[PDB]
Design an enzyme around this catalytic site. Structure first.
Site, PDB file in Angstrom:
ATOM      1  N   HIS A 139       0.886  -0.988   0.012  1.00 26.59           N
ATOM      2  CA  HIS A 139       0.020  -0.205   0.098  1.00 26.59           C
ATOM      3  C   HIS A 139       0.920   1.261  -0.076  1.00 26.59           C
ATOM      4  O   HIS A 139       0.787   2.335   0.807  1.00 26.59           O
ATOM      5  CB  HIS A 139      -1.073   0.109   1.082  1.00 26.59           C
ATOM      6  CG  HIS A 139      -2.314   0.607   0.988  1.00 26.59           C
ATOM      7  ND1 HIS A 139      -2.481   1.932   0.627  1.00 26.59           N
ATOM      8  CD2 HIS A 139      -3.412   0.011   0.658  1.00 26.59           C
ATOM      9  CE1 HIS A 139      -3.576   2.195   0.455  1.00 26.59           C
ATOM     10  NE2 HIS A 139      -4.317   1.029   0.515  1.00 26.59           N
ATOM     11  N   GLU A 400     -12.558  -0.624  -2.886  1.00 30.32           N
ATOM     12  CA  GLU A 400     -12.541   0.763  -2.423  1.00 30.32           C
ATOM     13  C   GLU A 400     -13.632   1.552  -2.984  1.00 30.32           C
ATOM     14  O   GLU A 400     -13.756   1.527  -4.159  1.00 30.32           O
ATOM     15  CB  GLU A 400     -11.219   1.130  -2.387  1.00 30.32           C
ATOM     16  CG  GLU A 400     -10.539   2.472  -1.571  1.00 30.32           C
ATOM     17  CD  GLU A 400      -9.331   2.695  -1.631  1.00 30.32           C
ATOM     18  OE1 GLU A 400      -8.589   2.160  -2.399  1.00 30.32           O
ATOM     19  OE2 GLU A 400      -8.748   3.671  -0.785  1.00 30.32           O
ATOM     20  N   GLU A 455      -5.141  10.614   5.193  1.00 24.54           N
ATOM     21  CA  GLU A 455      -5.624  10.634   3.784  1.00 24.54           C
ATOM     22  C   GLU A 455      -4.097  10.940   3.277  1.00 24.54           C
ATOM     23  O   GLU A 455      -3.604  12.217   3.356  1.00 24.54           O
ATOM     24  CB  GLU A 455      -6.565  11.529   3.495  1.00 24.54           C
ATOM     25  CG  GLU A 455      -7.009  11.547   1.857  1.00 24.54           C
ATOM     26  CD  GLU A 455      -7.711  10.168   1.384  1.00 24.54           C
ATOM     27  OE1 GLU A 455      -8.083   9.256   2.593  1.00 24.54           O
ATOM     28  OE2 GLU A 455      -7.990   9.902   0.399  1.00 24.54           O
ATOM     29  N   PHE A 456      -3.645  10.283   2.163  1.00 26.92           N
ATOM     30  CA  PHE A 456      -2.234  10.542   1.493  1.00 26.92           C
ATOM     31  C   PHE A 456      -2.467  11.815   0.854  1.00 26.92           C
ATOM     32  O   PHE A 456      -3.298  12.117  -0.117  1.00 26.92           O
ATOM     33  CB  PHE A 456      -2.163   9.228   0.614  1.00 26.92           C
ATOM     34  CG  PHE A 456      -1.688   8.153   1.097  1.00 26.92           C
ATOM     35  CD1 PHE A 456      -0.361   7.935   1.877  1.00 26.92           C
ATOM     36  CD2 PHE A 456      -2.280   6.851   1.250  1.00 26.92           C
ATOM     37  CE1 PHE A 456      -0.005   7.081   2.437  1.00 26.92           C
ATOM     38  CE2 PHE A 456      -1.975   5.797   1.781  1.00 26.92           C
ATOM     39  CZ  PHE A 456      -0.744   5.801   2.393  1.00 26.92           C
ATOM     40  N   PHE A 464     -13.069   9.859   5.380  1.00 25.91           N
ATOM     41  CA  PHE A 464     -13.630   8.976   4.390  1.00 25.91           C
ATOM     42  C   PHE A 464     -14.259   7.913   5.308  1.00 25.91           C
ATOM     43  O   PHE A 464     -15.171   6.842   4.857  1.00 25.91           O
ATOM     44  CB  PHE A 464     -12.617   8.080   3.500  1.00 25.91           C
ATOM     45  CG  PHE A 464     -12.525   9.033   2.152  1.00 25.91           C
ATOM     46  CD1 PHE A 464     -13.253   8.832   1.098  1.00 25.91           C
ATOM     47  CD2 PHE A 464     -11.280   9.591   1.931  1.00 25.91           C
ATOM     48  CE1 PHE A 464     -13.392   9.483  -0.020  1.00 25.91           C
ATOM     49  CE2 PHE A 464     -11.230  10.558   0.596  1.00 25.91           C
ATOM     50  CZ  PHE A 464     -12.263  10.435  -0.213  1.00 25.91           C
TER      51      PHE A 464
END
Ligand SMILES: *[C@@H]1O[C@H](CO)[C@@H](O[C@@H]2O[C@H](CO)[C@@H](O)[C@H](O)[C@H]2NC(C)=O)[C@H](O)[C@H]1NC(C)=O
Ligand code: NAG
Ligand code: NAG
Ligand code: NAG
Ligand code: NAG
Ligand code: NAG
Ligand code: NAG
Ligand code: NAG
Ligand code: NAG
Ligand code: NAG
Ligand code: NAG
Ligand code: NAG
Ligand code: NAG
Ligand code: NAG
Ligand code: NAG
Ligand code: NAG
Ligand code: CA
Lengths: 493, 493
Positions: A139, A400, A455-456, A464
């Site tokens: 990931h 996702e 969150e990236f 989210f």
């Protein structure tokens, strides 16, 4: 028969007319998370995202947040199961941190026993709750020393290291884990990490961004994606020939999916719309099916696009048992045949197209999704249909799918995420239609994410998760938002 | 002539009778800092201390602080010069971060131009302000990939990598920097980083602490210290043969110094007190002077103590032009011949001695220093005399000397650091005495630290700085504490 709504208002948040009975029995209604977003830095080595965020705090988010502490799921892993138990989630998708199992990167340098105990605890906890463990091998949290040694995936050495890391994971957790995912969103790393330089490791052309330590953005993305496919193919090779014999499980990659619409009613837009699908998805699906990139991409990119060897092509071809498709939004596609100077040219420009959020007249395809896009509920219908018709109808899981909410919202507003409910029900509504009408092989849906986390590239500015996590009181009970309550009632019969 | 006071009350805070005139004209009254505690994570790679703090937040401090942002001297470097200008500081000691100039660790892997601009800015700013640049090459901020490749200083490979990194620093900044320091407190790293496992990289015996990833507290410290001498000799070798010809500067190591007193009035304590000095100081000073380890240490440690080769012995011997002594407190020494099991034995036990805060009667040697020790002002007098008599040609610089204050103190209490004033004047008082009475060649004194910063293994729970830095408002003005005002008035005569 229920008529799914594409714009506001939405009636799919009523369980009286929209429930799990609209899907076939045995459908996986679950949640997902990522290692770097929940685990934290404790008990693990430093990875590439740690270096990228630390060196460029703005690049990791406006709030300068990082994956150091976040919600601390490495220590509070039981809390995640408690939220899932209240959600009646039959499955869960998480990532095994490479820098945790192998803090030094290479297997020969040592293996962290504390990592094995933590992951075994989470898997056993899921098994005790009868939850299906969906495991993501990679990931984007590559160990830092590997990048400092051979630039990560830029060198072919990563294939062997990824093989050993995957090989160890099967020996430890393969007895209970049956859903193995190699890499999440293969398209993201070469584009946003080696062309735009917005993600880790932060390589981009000098003219694109001076902050990047170095990069080309016209050759590196194709090299990195090429080596990623070899590493992904090798991991699938190890699992089937050694572990699938006894564990009896499946391994498959996960791709990022977007739907595309013509910018206007012209033929050039129609070609650009078709080209966008080919370059965004077929860039990897082509090699996954025929062992080579699409001919149009091969012609357009030319020598800048590498080619698989005869040995590699056989391994890459058919290197999947299932497909974890992720769909979020739909974008309009237009033609752009503008010649660009080499210093600022990026590999994304090779499609000779331009992707936009709005149509030619400025109309949105659906309700607002984030600050600069809108979600199109029917887009997931097209994506599942497109994958089924374009490629031999495979086993497909919605690994996702989620809706972003601003982080500045207070506790009452964040919990009352009726907009998130509207996003999830509508997308699920069209998902049921495409499964029934088009006979698409979709069996699982995983909402992103289980709870609010990092969150990236955005830090903690957006959420989210289906459950609110007050980051000032991470040890406090993580209450479920209104979307979480609806999802449980949707599952509950 | 001033009668130096050893206990409270202290009258040395009046500059009328005790001022900088008590030292020879041209004495360097300055301040010091280290890279990891002030610079920050921006614009630099990840080092071993980043991994140590991230993996073990408690080990880096009770507050779980780290060197990510601290006072952000990488962004606020002009602020440090402004505080020094207000202090009338004639010199300054700082460290060049290896992970900043060489984020990838190896010189062949690339050099960060932004690092060069940052260091040149600080050096040029100091020169314009008539500040003496004291530069420490290595302050325990080893690049992480180097540790992940060859276990850091545990391997002899570190000598070559450190040699190239030091060579680059002379080429870039040697035109203006004339005071080069190789390693700070040679004794600390093998003991607290490879025996006790309390500092980075955190290697210790399994019985000492299960949190340590691994290590041998009886063999690793001697190997690591052996390679440090080889690395230190190599750095001096490069400077003398290439840069000393034209740049006309001096290079010297920095060691931690402690004074030792008998636990009681017995002969056994007196023998143990002499042994404590040999093991704490002679471990490196012996090889630095005679090219070999102390005979008593060679007999006691035996095969666990390595030996220098003929080539190495010549290089290590006389590999210094000055000595940067750091003295904080004095400890009592007693005899302890208790045999310990090998699994829990540490290299510190090889002296067969026990270091205590109080003597046999329970009396402290001086006023309290921190929560678990007391400072003895006359100890610095003994250290300079001991080093001068034991080691001929005693060119000595006081690179570190300071008093810690609790972090829980409010703004008013922290600014009113009269306890720090008492510590500084008294130690300076005996420093003047030993220069005159014992004719010790001491020319510079550097108070620790310039401002409040991150403290290794303690986070931000304590403050060593002469100027208050509100860490909630790091961009705000860094006001000088009462000790800072006194120090300026001490010089301004
Ligand atoms: C020397 O130390 C004494 C003791 O702290 C200082 O006297 C203090 O002065 C401050 C500000 O003038 C007062 O707030 C304190 O109350 C005083 N101390 C006491 C015990 O009353 C004195 O100013 C110092 N002088 C120098 C030159 O440093
Ligand atoms: C559905 O959404 C509306 C929008 O305001 C809300 O009032 C209602 O309570 C929701 N009902 C359910 C069952 O989620
Ligand atoms: C399903 O959710 C309910 C709601 O709290 C919970 O009581 C129950 O234990 C859950 N079932 C499973 C199998 O987790
Ligand atoms: C890949 O691996 C080794 C590592 O030393 C190196 O010799 C080789 O040149 C590397 N190739 C690239 C393109 O970095
Ligand atoms: C504007 O968007 C609508 C639907 O959102 C679409 O039907 C229309 O074709 C778009 N405008 C143009 C000029 O294509
Ligand atoms: C077409 O591409 C060029 C360069 O790639 C870009 O400057 C331009 O904005 C693009 N067109 C549109 C409509 O965005
Ligand atoms: C990328 O590499 C190619 C090699 O053909 C070169 O022509 C181009 O200038 C490079 N890009 C940059 C931004 O230097
Ligand atoms: C934090 O959460 C805990 C949960 O046990 C609770 O007891 C405590 O009151 C909370 N504190 C705040 C400030 O919300
Ligand atoms: C439905 O919810 C009830 C609690 O209201 C729970 O006991 C039951 O297990 C849920 N159904 C399933 C299939 O888990
Ligand atoms: C000494 O410090 C004072 C601060 O009060 C400052 O005004 C003065 O310029 C300094 N003198 C120097 C730097 O020579
Ligand atoms: C460094 O240690 C490793 C063993 O882990 C090995 O590569 C090598 O033998 C050592 N270096 C040297 C110079 O021997
Ligand atoms: C302990 O120290 C005090 C002063 O520091 C001294 O008066 C006393 O004699 C000492 N006792 C011993 C050395 O036994
Ligand atoms: C002597 O050393 C042993 C082992 O290090 C320790 O247990 C003991 O407490 C020491 N004696 C004293 C008086 O501290
Ligand atoms: C350290 O090494 C020595 C000899 O190499 C050995 O006897 C001892 O058991 C080792 N200690 C540990 C904790 O393994
Ligand atoms: C921060 O410090 C600056 C300068 O000292 C000051 O002007 C400002 O008011 C401070 N702000 C806060 C919130 O403390
Ligand atoms: C004292 O302070 C003044 C302030 O401008 C400064 O110029 C001077 O160099 C300092 N030192 C002496 C000895 O005057
Ligand atoms: Ca951090």
């Amino acid at each position: 028969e229920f008529v799914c709504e594409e714009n506001e208002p939405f009636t799919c948040n009523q369980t009286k007319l929209f429930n799990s009975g609209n899907f076939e029995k045995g459908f996986i209604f679950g949640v997902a998370s990522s290692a770097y977003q929940v685990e934290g830095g404790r008990g693990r080595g430093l990875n590439v995202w740690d270096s990228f965020t630390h060196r460029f705090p703005e690049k990791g988010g406006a709030d300068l947040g990082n994956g150091d502490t976040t919600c601390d799921s490495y220590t509070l892993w039981q809390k995640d199961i408690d939220v899932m138990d209240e959600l009646n989630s039959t499955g869960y998708r998480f990532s095994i941190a490479w820098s945790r199992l192998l803090p030094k990167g290479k297997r020969s340098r040592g293996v962290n026993p504390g990592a094995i105990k933590y992951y075994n605890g989470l898997i056993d906890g899921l098994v005790a709750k009868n939850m299906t463990p969906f495991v993501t091998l990679f990931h984007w949290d590559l160990p830092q020393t590997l990048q400092d040694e051979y630039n990560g995936f830029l060198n072919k050495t990563i294939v062997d290291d990824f093989k050993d890391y995957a090989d160890l994971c099967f020996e430890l957790f393969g007895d209970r884990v049956k859903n193995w995912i190699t890499i999440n969103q293969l398209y993201t790393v070469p584009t946003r990490g080696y062309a735009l330089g917005t993600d880790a490791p932060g390589r981009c052309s000098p003219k694109i961004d001076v902050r990047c330590p170095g990069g080309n953005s016209s050759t590196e993305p194709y090299i990195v994606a090429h080596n990623q496919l070899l590493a992904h193919a090798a991991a699938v090779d190890v699992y089937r020939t050694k572990y699938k014999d006894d564990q009896k499980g499946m391994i498959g990659p996960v791709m990022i999916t977007r739907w595309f619409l013509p910018f206007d009613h012209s033929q050039e837009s129609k070609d650009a719309t078709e080209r966008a699908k080919i370059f965004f998805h077929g860039w990897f699906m082509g090699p996954l099916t025929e062992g080579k990139y699409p001919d149009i991409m091969r012609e357009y990119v030319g020598d800048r696009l590498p080619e698989f060897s005869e040995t590699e092509a056989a391994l890459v071809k058919g290197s999947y048992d299932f497909l974890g498709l992720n769909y979020y939004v739909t974008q309009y596609a237009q033609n752009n045949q503008t010649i660009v100077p080499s210093d600022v040219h990026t590999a994304l420009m090779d499609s000779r197209t331009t992707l936009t959020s709005k149509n030619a007249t400025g109309h949105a395809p659906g309700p607002p999704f984030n600050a600069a896009s809108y979600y199109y509920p029917k887009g997931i219908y097209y994506v599942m249909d497109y994958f089924k018709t374009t490629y031999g109808d495979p086993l497909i899981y919605v690994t996702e799918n989620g809706f972003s909410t601003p982080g500045d919202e207070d506790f009452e507003k964040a919990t009352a995420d009726y907009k998130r409910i509207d996003y999830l029900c509508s997308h699920l509504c069209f998902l049921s239609k495409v499964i029934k009408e088009k006979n698409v092989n979709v069996k699982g849906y995983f909402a992103w994410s289980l709870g609010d986390n990092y969150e990236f590239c955005n830090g903690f500015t957006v959420r989210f998760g289906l459950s609110y996590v007050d980051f000032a009181n991470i040890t406090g009970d993580r209450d479920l938002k209104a979307s979480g309550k609806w999802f449980q009632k949707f599952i509950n019969v």
